[PDB]
Amino acid sequence: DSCIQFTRHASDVLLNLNRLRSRDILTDVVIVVSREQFRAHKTVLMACSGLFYSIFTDQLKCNLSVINLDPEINPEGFCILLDFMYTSRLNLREGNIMAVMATAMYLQMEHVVDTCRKFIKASE
Amino acid sequence: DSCIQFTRHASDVLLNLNRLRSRDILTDVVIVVSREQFRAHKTVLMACSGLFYSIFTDQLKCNLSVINLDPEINPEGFCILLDFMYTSRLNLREGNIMAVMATAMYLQMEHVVDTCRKFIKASE
């Protein structure tokens, strides 16, 4: 086509989706990770995660307001990944890298899994 | 903070939100523009438009499944702007620029209004 493109548009959309998440606006699901609860938008979760894409395209699960994750999932690892989904920024630290990588593998977030593997390999 | 950032994350999220729109997945509103109907995600519309941000933060309008736009709004101008919201690409042409600018002013999409004004000024 002969379209023009606004470079900062995708980043501006994501920034606004994060603002709606912080103010709890039009969030339509709660993700339960052991004792912890996280409110989010189903569309954003599907757009970032192969696991959520599979769950919310399912004819019965698409209508659930609560999703319970596997009990082995660490709430802090989930929180870091949810923050990444809404911002593009990953808070990866020596103290959380193993939990972040295991959560990213479970959530099917291949680019996160890749950077965790590289950061681990460098420390070996 | 000490976060790392994935450069293509925002663009990848927007690409996936557009794929969900094309397959009509978890769309929660229909925008009526005279005889034409457009399905979309309320969160994306709010993230891109000052008008939709105002409508869907309203305690009564947030629950509507149908929104009727002003009859002066051109359906093609709306379609071009909806495509821009989901892709960052604006199909701006001599034959549609006046309708696109008027629709962007109504929708309160200031960056679109700005480029339309500049493209019009250059033709004068």
Partner: peptide, 4 residues
Amino acid sequence: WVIP
């Protein structure tokens, strides 16, 4: 704005 750019030419993509």
